[PDB]
């Protein structure tokens, strides 16, 4: 049954990837504001 | 039933790819502003 | 029914490809501005 | 049975990754506020 | 049986990582408040 | 049998890491209160 | 047999680290009370 | 055999570290009471 | 054989460190009583 | 052979350190009684 | 040979330090009795 | 050869320090008896 | 050769210090008897 | 050559200090007998 | 040459100090006999 | 040349001090005999 | 030249002091004989 | 209830610190007047 | 109940510190008047 | 309610710090006048 | 029960300190009047 | 409501820091005048 | 039981200190009246 | 509303930093004058 | 509206950074003068 | 049992100190009346 | 309108960077003079 | 047993001190009456 | 119009980069002189 | 018109790159001198 | 056994001191009556 | 006309590339000297 | 006319390529010397 | 006439190709020496 | 005979190819598990 | 005969390839476990 | 004969490759244990 | 003949590579023990 | 002939690399012992 | 000829590297002994 | 000719590095002896 | 010509570094002797 | 010409550093002798 | 011209540093002689 | 012109420092003579 | 013009410091003569 | 105008300090003559 | 206007200090003449 | 107006101090004449 | 108004002090005339 | 109103002190005339 | 009302003191006339 538990770990890693991508969006806004 | 759970993980990874692409759009605006 | 869920994942990957292509358009504008 | 215990450790590491990503979101807000 | 004891040590290190990530969230709030 | 004794030392070091992380949480609250 | 005696010394150093971490928790409460 | 005697010295130094850490706990209580 | 005699001196210095740490505990109680 | 004689002097200095530490314990009791 | 004679002087100074430390113990008892 | 004569003077000064320390012990007993 | 004569004066001053210390011992006995 | 004559004066002053110290010993015996 | 004559005066004053110290010894015996 | 004459006066005053000190010795014997 | 004449007066006063001191010696013998 | 009584003692010590600081102000005026 | 009695002693010592500080204020006025 | 009383003590200590700082200003004027 | 009796002695010594401080206030007035 | 009272204490400590900084300015003028 | 008797002696010495302090107050009034 | 009060404390700390920086400028002038 | 007040604090911190940089310029002149 | 008898002597000396202090009070009144 | 105020803060930080760079130029001259 | 007899002498001397102190009280009344 | 103000900040940062590069040139001269 | 201002910033960054390249030339001379 | 006989002489001298003190009390009454 | 200004920036970047290439030549000489 | 200016930039980039190729020749000599 | 200028750029690129080919010859010698 | 030795090298390379192919089988299982 | 020595080097390189392939097998197991 | 010496270097490099491959095997076991 | 000396350097570098590979083996054991 | 001297430097650097690799082996043993 | 002198400096730096590596070996033994 | 003088300085700095490395060897022996 | 004089200063600083390194060697011997 | 005078000051400071280093050597001998 | 006068002051301060360093050498000899 | 007068004061203070350093040399000789 | 008058006072204080330093030299000679 | 009058008082106090320093020189000569 | 009158008193006290210092000079001559 | 009258008293006391200092000068001449 | 009358008494006491100081001057002349 | 009458008595006592001081002046003239 | 009558007695005693002082003046004239 350990397989299901690693599958939940896979979903939680995907949520971490979503939130890191939103962080990259806001860092790109910071680069736009620094470039001017 | 673990298969369905990995399929949800696949969808969440695709959402992460969408948000990374929007981050690349805004970084490209930053490169346009730095190039001038 | 997992098949339908992977098909939604296919559509979301295609949206990611669209947004990456717009990022490449704006990076090409940055290369035009750097080339002058 | 040690395998299950490492699987719980994998889930807890994934939770740590989620919270680090939220920290990166708020640090990116700090960079937006410093860039202006 | 020492293996199980190191596995408990792995879980406790993961709990330490969770709490360090919450500390990074609150330090990022401190950086937002200093940036204004 | 010394191996087991070092494994207990590993667990006690992990408990020390947990309590240091809680100390970092409260120091981050102190930084939030100083930043205002 | 000296090895076992140093292993007991390792455990006692880990107990010292635990109590120093609790001291850091209470010093962080002192910093919260000074920051207001 | 001098090695064993230095190992006993190592244990006694670790006991000194434990008691110094308890002294730091009570000094932190003193700082909490002075901060109010 | 002088080496053994310095090792006894090392043990006696460690006993001095233990008793100084207990003195620091009681001085910290004195600071708690003065802080109120 | 003078080396052995200085080693005895080292032991006697360590005994002096032990008794000074006990004096510091009792002075700390005096500070507790004065603080109330 | 004067070196040996100074080494005896070093031992006698260490005995003086021992007896001064016992004097400090009894003066600390005097401070405990005055503090009440 | 005057060096040896000053070394004897050093030993006699150390004996004076021993007897002054015993005088301080008995003066501390006098302070204990006056403090009650 | 006057140097040797001052060295004898140094020894006689050290003897005076020894006898003054014995006088201080007996004066401390007098203080013990007066304190009761 | 007057230097030697003052050095003899220094020795005679040291003898005076020795005899004054013996006088202080006997005065301390007188104080012990008066204190009872 | 007057310097030598004052140096003889210094020696005679030191002899006076020796004899005054012996007088103080015998006066201290008189105080011992009066104290009983 | 008057300086030499005052120096002789200084020597004669020192002789007077010697004889006064012997008078004090014999008066102290008189006090010993009266004290019994 | 009157200065020299006062210096002779100083010497004669010192001779008077010598003879008064011998008178005090013999009066002290008289006190010893009266004390018995 | 003794805690409240020590808290009143803390307030009275703070008043003493205020008045000592005013004394230091006027001593600094005295140093200005002495420096000219 | 002796604790309460020492707490009253602590308050009375604090009153003594207040009045000593007022004495230092007036001594500083005296130093200002002497400095002119 | 003792907490409020220590908070008043904190305010009075801050007033003491203000007045000590004004004393340091005037001592610095005294150092300027002494330096010339 | 002797402890209570020394505590009363502590209170009476504190009253003595209060009255000595008032004496120092009036001596400071005397110094102000002498300085003019 | 104690929080507001500590906030007033924070403001008064900041005023103390301002006045200490002005004291450091004038001490730096004193160092300029001493350096010449 | 002699301890209790010395404790009564301690109280009577404290009463003597109180009355000496009142004497110092009135001597300070005498100094104020002499200073005018 | 306590937030506004800490914000005023932040402004006053910034004024303290300005004045400390001017003090560092004048200390650097003092170092230039000492270096020659 | 507290945001505006922290923005004024940000400007005052930037002024502090300007003046610290001028202090570093003059300390570098001091290092040039010491290096020769 | 002689110890108890000296303790009674200590109490009687303390009574003598009380009455001498009252004598000093009345002598201070005499100084006030002479100062006018 | 707070945005404009942070933009002024950005300009003042850039001025601080200019002056720090001039300080680094003069420190590099100091290193050239020390290297010879 | 002579020790007990000297202890009775000590008590009788203390009674003499009490009565001399009462004599000083009445002489101080005489000084008050003469001062008017 | 804030955009223009950030553009001026961009120019001032570029001036800072120019002056840092000149500092690196002179530090490289210092390294040439140290390498020989 | 902001575009022209960023173009001037681009030219100033290119000047910074030129001067950094000259710094790299001189650091390479330093490496040649260290390699021998 | 002569020691006991001198101890009786010491007691009789103490009785003489008591009666002389009563004589001083009555002479002080005589001074009070003469002062009016 | 901004186009011409970016063309000047292109020329200045090419000059930077020339000077970086000369730096690489001299670093290659440094590698030849280190390889032997 | 901007075309001519980019053509000069093309020539300067070709000169950079020539000098990079000479750097690669000397790095290849360094590889020959390291290979032996 | 820009055509001629690009033709000179073509010749300079061909010279760069010649020198890169000589670099490849010497790197091939390095590979021969490493292969043995 | 070197030919046989290269033939053994050929066999060992073929074994390496077998094990790399099994690695590709398991990587293909990993791709199947990631594709769902 | 160097040819044989390079042939042994060829065999040892083939053994390295075998062990790298087993490492790739176990890394593929790690990828299977991460993919779930 | 240098050729033979480089051939021995080739064999030693092949042994290094074997041991690095065993290190990669054990790192792959570490990745398997982390993946669960 | 320098060629032979560099060939010995090549062999010693290969020995260094062997020992670094054994260090990597033992670090991989450390990673296996940390992963559990 | 300097070439030979740098070749000896190359050999000594290779010996340094050997001994650093043995240090890394023993640090890896330390990591194995800490990991348990 | 300075080149030869720097080559001797290169050899002495290589000897320093050898001895630092032996120091790292013994520090690694210290870490092994602390890890147990 | 100054170049030669700096080259001698380079050699003397290398000798300093050798002796510092021997100091680090003996400090590592001290750490081995403290670790047991 | 000042350059030569600073070069002599560089040599004298290098001699100071040599002697400080020998001091560190002997302090490390002191640490070895204290560690036993 | 002041530059030359500061260069002489630099040489004299270097001589001071040499003599301080010899003082540190002899203090390290003192620490070796105290450590035994 | 005041600059030259401060430069002479710099030289005289350097002479003071030389003589203080010789004083530290002789104090270190005193510590060597006391340590035996 | 006052600046020149303070510069003369600086020179006279430096002469005072020279003579104080010679006093410290001779006090260190006194400590050497007392240590034997 | 008072500034000039204080500058003359500064010079006279420096002369006082010179003469006090010569007094310390001669007191150090006195300590050398007493130490023998 | 009182300021000028205090400045004259400052000069007269400095003259007093000069003459006290000459008195200390001659008292040090007296100590040299007494020490022999 | 009383301030001016106290300033005249300050000058007259400074004249008294000058004449007391001359008295100390002549008393030091008296001590030189007595020391011989 | 009484203040002015006490200021005249202060001046007259300062005149008394001047004349007492002249008396001390002439008494010091008397001591010089007695010392010879 | 009695205050003014005591102020006149203060002035008359100061006149008495002046005339007593003149009496001490003439008594010092008498001592000079007796000392010769 | 008796206070005023004692104040007149104080003035008359001060007149008595003035006339006694004139008597001491004339007695000092008598001592000058007797000393010759 | 008797108090007023004693105050008149105090005034009449002060008149007696005035007339006794005039008698002492005329007796001092008698001593001047007898001394000649």
Residue numbers in the entry:
A (entry chain j), B (entry chain p), C (entry chain v), D (entry chain d), E (entry chain X), F (entry chain R), ...: 1 to 36
Give passages from the manuscript:
Here we report seven high-resolution cryo-EM structures of filamentous peptide nanotubes based on a cross-α supramolecular architecture that provide insight into the designability of helical peptide filaments. A structural interaction is identified based on an appropriately placed pair of arginine residues (RxxxR) within the corresponding peptide sequences. This local interaction motif, designated as an arginine clasp, is robust within the context of these cross-α assemblies and can guide the coalescence of helical protofilaments into structurally defined cross-α nanotubes. In contrast to most structurally characterized filaments based on synthetic α-helical coiled-coils, the chain axes of the helical protomers are oriented in a plane nearly perpendicular to the long axis of the assembly.
Therefore, the designed series of Form I-like peptides encompassed minimal peptide sequences in which the structurally determinative distance between the RxxxR motif and the C-terminus was systematically varied over the range from 2 to 5 heptad repeats. Three filaments, derived from peptides 15-10-3, 29-24-3, and 36-31-3, were selected for further analysis using cryo-EM imaging with direct electron detection. Five protofilaments interacted to form the 15-10-3 filament, four interacted in the 29-24-3 filament, and three interacted in the 36-31-3 filament. Similarly, the 4-start helices of 29-17-3 and 29-24-3 and the 3-start helices of 36-31-3, passing through every fourth subunit and every third subunit, respectively, were associated with the axial stacking direction of the protofilaments within the corresponding assemblies. Similarly, the filament structure of 36-31-3 revealed that the C-terminus of peptide (i) interacted with the axially offset RxxxR motif of peptide (i + 5) within the 1-start (C1) symmetry of the assembly. Finally, while the local helix crossing angle associated with the arginine clasp interaction was maintained at 94°, the distal segments of the 36-31-3 helices bend at a more acute crossing angle of 80° in order to maintain the overall helical symmetry of the filament. The results of this analysis are reported for the 36-31-3 filament, although similar results were obtained for the other Form I-like assemblies. The motif comprised a seven-residue helical fragment containing the RxxxR motif and a five-residue fragment from the C-terminus of a laterally interacting helix. Rather, some of the closest matches arose in the context of an internal helix-helix interaction between two closely-approaching helices, necessitating a Gly at the position above. The results suggested that the arginine clasp motif, which involves a helix terminus interacting with the side of another helix at a nearly 100° angle, was not common within the structures of naturally occurring proteins and, consequently, not natively designable.
